[PDB]
Ligand binder design. Sequence first.
Ligand SMILES: Nc1ncnc2c1ncn2[C@@H]1O[C@H](COP(=O)(O)OP(=O)(O)OP(=O)(O)O)[C@@H](O)[C@H]1O
Ligand SMILES: [Mg+2]
Ligand SMILES: [Mg+2]
Length: 153
Amino acid sequence: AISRTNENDPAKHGDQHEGQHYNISPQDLETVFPHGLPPRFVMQVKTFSEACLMVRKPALELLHYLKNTSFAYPAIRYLLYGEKGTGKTLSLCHVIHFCAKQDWLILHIPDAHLWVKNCRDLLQSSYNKQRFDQPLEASTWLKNFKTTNERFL
RNA sequence: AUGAGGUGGCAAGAAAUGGGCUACAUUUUCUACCCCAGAAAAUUUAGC
Ligand SMILES: Nc1ncnc2c1ncn2[C@@H]1O[C@H](COP(=O)(O)OP(=O)(O)OP(=O)(O)O)[C@@H](O)[C@H]1O
Ligand SMILES: [Mg+2]
Ligand SMILES: [Mg+2]
Protein backbone atom coordinates (compact mmCIF):
# COMPACT_ATOMS: atom_id res chain seq x y z
CA ALA A 1 0.00 0.00 0.00
CA ILE A 2 2.38 2.69 -1.26
CA SER A 3 -0.53 5.17 -1.43
CA ARG A 4 -1.41 4.81 2.28
CA THR A 5 0.24 6.17 5.42
CA ASN A 6 -0.05 4.48 8.81
CA GLU A 7 0.19 7.87 10.58
CA ASN A 8 -3.51 8.64 11.12
CA ASP A 9 -2.68 11.62 13.37
CA PRO A 10 -2.91 14.92 11.44
CA ALA A 11 -0.58 16.68 13.93
CA LYS A 12 2.39 14.58 12.73
CA HIS A 13 2.07 14.85 8.94
CA GLY A 14 4.96 16.38 7.03
CA ASP A 15 6.56 16.51 3.58
CA GLN A 16 7.41 12.79 3.72
CA HIS A 17 3.69 11.91 3.89
CA GLU A 18 2.88 13.89 0.72
CA GLY A 19 0.91 11.86 -1.79
CA GLN A 20 -0.14 9.28 0.82
CA HIS A 21 -3.65 8.65 2.12
CA TYR A 22 -4.44 8.70 5.84
CA ASN A 23 -7.61 7.27 7.34
CA ILE A 24 -10.27 9.14 9.32
CA SER A 25 -12.08 6.95 11.83
CA PRO A 26 -15.89 6.62 11.74
CA GLN A 27 -16.05 8.33 15.13
CA ASP A 28 -14.04 11.26 13.77
CA LEU A 29 -16.19 11.20 10.62
CA GLU A 30 -19.49 11.51 12.49
CA THR A 31 -18.17 13.98 15.07
CA VAL A 32 -15.83 16.34 13.21
CA PHE A 33 -17.62 16.15 9.82
CA PRO A 34 -21.41 15.97 9.98
CA HIS A 35 -21.58 18.47 7.10
CA GLY A 36 -18.09 19.42 5.91
CA LEU A 37 -17.14 16.83 3.33
CA PRO A 38 -18.00 17.43 -0.36
CA PRO A 39 -21.15 15.64 -1.55
CA ARG A 40 -19.26 13.40 -4.00
CA PHE A 41 -16.63 12.43 -1.41
CA VAL A 42 -19.37 11.09 0.88
CA MET A 43 -20.34 8.68 -1.91
CA GLN A 44 -16.74 7.43 -2.00
CA VAL A 45 -16.75 7.04 1.79
CA LYS A 46 -20.00 5.06 1.64
CA THR A 47 -18.80 2.86 -1.24
CA PHE A 48 -15.27 2.14 0.03
CA SER A 49 -16.46 1.82 3.66
CA GLU A 50 -13.57 4.10 4.69
CA ALA A 51 -12.65 7.80 4.49
CA CYS A 52 -9.06 8.42 3.38
CA LEU A 53 -7.54 11.82 2.59
CA MET A 54 -4.32 12.40 0.66
CA VAL A 55 -1.73 14.58 2.37
CA ARG A 56 -0.89 17.49 0.05
CA LYS A 57 1.35 20.57 0.16
CA PRO A 58 -1.46 23.13 0.67
CA ALA A 59 -2.69 21.37 3.81
CA LEU A 60 0.87 20.80 5.04
CA GLU A 61 1.71 24.50 4.68
CA LEU A 62 -1.53 25.58 6.35
CA LEU A 63 -0.86 23.13 9.20
CA HIS A 64 2.68 24.45 9.66
CA TYR A 65 1.19 27.95 9.85
CA LEU A 66 -1.35 26.88 12.49
CA LYS A 67 1.22 25.01 14.61
CA ASN A 68 3.34 28.17 14.98
CA THR A 69 0.43 30.60 15.43
CA SER A 70 0.73 33.13 18.25
CA PHE A 71 -2.57 33.25 20.14
CA ALA A 72 -1.87 36.75 21.51
CA TYR A 73 -1.81 38.39 18.08
CA PRO A 74 -5.09 39.01 16.21
CA ALA A 75 -6.48 36.06 14.29
CA ILE A 76 -4.88 35.57 10.87
CA ARG A 77 -7.02 35.02 7.77
CA TYR A 78 -6.02 32.13 5.50
CA LEU A 79 -7.72 31.88 2.10
CA LEU A 80 -7.45 28.71 0.01
CA TYR A 81 -7.82 29.47 -3.70
CA GLY A 82 -7.41 27.44 -6.87
CA GLU A 83 -9.06 26.25 -10.04
CA LYS A 84 -12.30 24.28 -9.97
CA GLY A 85 -12.13 20.89 -8.28
CA THR A 86 -8.51 21.18 -7.13
CA GLY A 87 -9.12 19.93 -3.58
CA LYS A 88 -9.28 23.14 -1.53
CA THR A 89 -12.42 21.96 0.30
CA LEU A 90 -10.70 18.74 1.35
CA SER A 91 -7.60 20.71 2.39
CA LEU A 92 -9.86 22.79 4.63
CA CYS A 93 -11.34 19.54 5.94
CA HIS A 94 -7.83 18.25 6.70
CA VAL A 95 -7.09 21.43 8.65
CA ILE A 96 -10.42 21.17 10.51
CA HIS A 97 -9.60 17.58 11.47
CA PHE A 98 -6.18 18.67 12.72
CA CYS A 99 -7.70 21.43 14.85
CA ALA A 100 -10.45 19.21 16.26
CA LYS A 101 -7.98 16.65 17.65
CA GLN A 102 -6.23 19.40 19.67
CA ASP A 103 -9.43 20.40 21.52
CA TRP A 104 -10.05 23.49 19.43
CA LEU A 105 -13.58 24.87 19.19
CA ILE A 106 -14.69 24.40 15.57
CA LEU A 107 -16.91 26.96 13.82
CA HIS A 108 -17.31 25.23 10.45
CA ILE A 109 -19.52 26.67 7.69
CA PRO A 110 -19.78 23.92 5.03
CA ASP A 111 -21.08 26.18 2.25
CA ALA A 112 -21.89 29.87 2.62
CA HIS A 113 -23.48 29.95 -0.84
CA LEU A 114 -26.56 28.12 0.50
CA TRP A 115 -27.46 31.16 2.63
CA VAL A 116 -27.78 33.51 -0.38
CA LYS A 117 -29.97 31.44 -2.71
CA ASN A 118 -33.11 29.31 -2.68
CA CYS A 119 -34.64 30.28 0.69
CA ARG A 120 -38.36 29.53 1.03
CA ASP A 121 -39.02 30.52 4.68
CA LEU A 122 -37.56 34.03 4.82
CA LEU A 123 -38.64 36.02 7.88
CA GLN A 124 -38.14 39.51 9.30
CA SER A 125 -36.11 39.73 12.51
CA SER A 126 -37.85 40.86 15.67
CA TYR A 127 -34.40 41.86 16.96
CA ASN A 128 -33.79 44.27 14.07
CA LYS A 129 -36.71 44.95 11.76
CA GLN A 130 -34.37 45.81 8.84
CA ARG A 131 -32.82 42.31 8.65
CA PHE A 132 -34.12 38.90 7.57
CA ASP A 133 -33.95 35.50 9.27
CA GLN A 134 -33.33 32.10 7.69
CA PRO A 135 -34.62 29.62 10.29
CA LEU A 136 -34.16 26.51 8.13
CA GLU A 137 -30.54 27.34 7.31
CA ALA A 138 -29.71 28.42 10.87
CA SER A 139 -31.29 25.44 12.66
CA THR A 140 -29.64 22.98 10.27
CA TRP A 141 -26.23 24.47 11.09
CA LEU A 142 -26.96 24.62 14.82
CA LYS A 143 -27.52 20.87 15.07
CA ASN A 144 -24.19 20.06 13.43
CA PHE A 145 -22.39 22.70 15.50
CA LYS A 146 -23.81 20.99 18.59
CA THR A 147 -22.64 17.62 17.25
CA THR A 148 -19.08 18.81 16.57
CA ASN A 149 -18.56 20.76 19.82
CA GLU A 150 -20.82 18.86 22.23
CA ARG A 151 -18.11 18.70 24.90
CA PHE A 152 -17.64 22.46 25.28
CA LEU A 153 -21.35 23.38 25.29
C1' A B 1 -78.01 52.51 -67.43
C1' U B 2 -74.10 46.59 -66.63
C1' G B 3 -73.13 54.64 -64.78
C1' A B 4 -73.84 57.91 -59.84
C1' G B 5 -76.47 58.38 -55.36
C1' G B 6 -80.57 58.49 -50.73
C1' U B 7 -83.54 55.61 -47.37
C1' G B 8 -84.08 51.39 -44.58
C1' G B 9 -83.35 45.93 -44.28
C1' C B 10 -79.76 41.49 -44.85
C1' A B 11 -77.51 39.03 -38.86
C1' A B 12 -78.59 32.61 -39.87
C1' G B 13 -78.82 26.48 -37.51
C1' A B 14 -77.46 20.96 -37.95
C1' A B 15 -74.46 17.20 -38.34
C1' A B 16 -70.46 14.02 -41.57
C1' U B 17 -65.68 14.83 -43.18
C1' G B 18 -60.60 17.91 -44.48
C1' G B 19 -57.24 21.27 -42.93
C1' G B 20 -54.95 25.24 -39.78
C1' C B 21 -53.48 27.78 -34.60
C1' U B 22 -51.98 26.86 -29.14
C1' A B 23 -49.77 23.80 -24.36
C1' C B 24 -48.80 19.00 -23.94
C1' A B 25 -42.47 17.91 -18.36
C1' U B 26 -38.45 14.44 -15.59
C1' U B 27 -33.42 13.24 -21.36
C1' U B 28 -38.56 18.43 -17.70
C1' U B 29 -38.65 23.50 -15.50
C1' C B 30 -36.48 28.17 -12.59
C1' U B 31 -31.74 30.88 -11.09
C1' A B 32 -26.02 31.32 -11.60
C1' C B 33 -23.29 29.97 -15.62
C1' C B 34 -22.68 28.72 -20.84
C1' C B 35 -22.06 22.07 -19.44
C1' C B 36 -18.31 19.27 -12.06
C1' A B 37 -23.95 23.89 -8.94
C1' G B 38 -28.63 25.00 -5.89
C1' A B 39 -33.96 24.40 -5.82
C1' A B 40 -39.05 22.98 -7.87
C1' A B 41 -42.19 19.41 -9.25
C1' A B 42 -54.42 0.26 -34.64
C1' U B 43 -54.77 2.88 -39.20
C1' U B 44 -52.00 6.73 -41.52
C1' U B 45 -48.54 10.94 -43.09
C1' A B 46 -43.52 12.31 -43.85
C1' G B 47 -38.20 11.60 -43.99
C1' C B 48 -33.82 9.85 -44.46
N1 LIG C 1 -6.85 15.50 -0.58
C1 LIG C 1 -7.70 14.76 -1.29
N2 LIG C 1 -7.87 13.47 -0.94
C2 LIG C 1 -8.72 12.72 -1.65
N3 LIG C 1 -9.47 13.06 -2.70
C3 LIG C 1 -9.28 14.35 -3.02
C4 LIG C 1 -8.44 15.24 -2.39
N4 LIG C 1 -8.50 16.49 -3.00
C5 LIG C 1 -9.37 16.32 -3.96
N5 LIG C 1 -9.88 15.05 -4.04
C6 LIG C 1 -10.85 14.55 -5.00
O1 LIG C 1 -11.32 15.68 -5.73
C7 LIG C 1 -12.74 15.83 -5.57
C8 LIG C 1 -13.02 17.31 -5.53
O2 LIG C 1 -12.35 17.90 -4.40
P1 LIG C 1 -12.94 19.16 -3.65
O3 LIG C 1 -14.39 18.99 -3.39
O4 LIG C 1 -12.09 19.43 -2.42
O5 LIG C 1 -12.67 20.33 -4.68
P2 LIG C 1 -12.72 21.92 -4.67
O6 LIG C 1 -11.44 22.42 -5.32
O7 LIG C 1 -13.01 22.45 -3.32
O8 LIG C 1 -13.91 22.22 -5.68
P3 LIG C 1 -14.85 23.42 -6.13
O9 LIG C 1 -14.07 24.45 -6.88
O10 LIG C 1 -15.95 22.76 -6.97
O11 LIG C 1 -15.46 23.94 -4.83
C9 LIG C 1 -12.99 15.18 -4.22
O12 LIG C 1 -14.32 14.69 -4.26
C10 LIG C 1 -12.08 13.96 -4.31
O13 LIG C 1 -12.67 13.12 -5.29
MG1 LIG D 1 -15.09 23.42 -2.69
MG1 LIG E 1 -75.91 37.01 -42.34
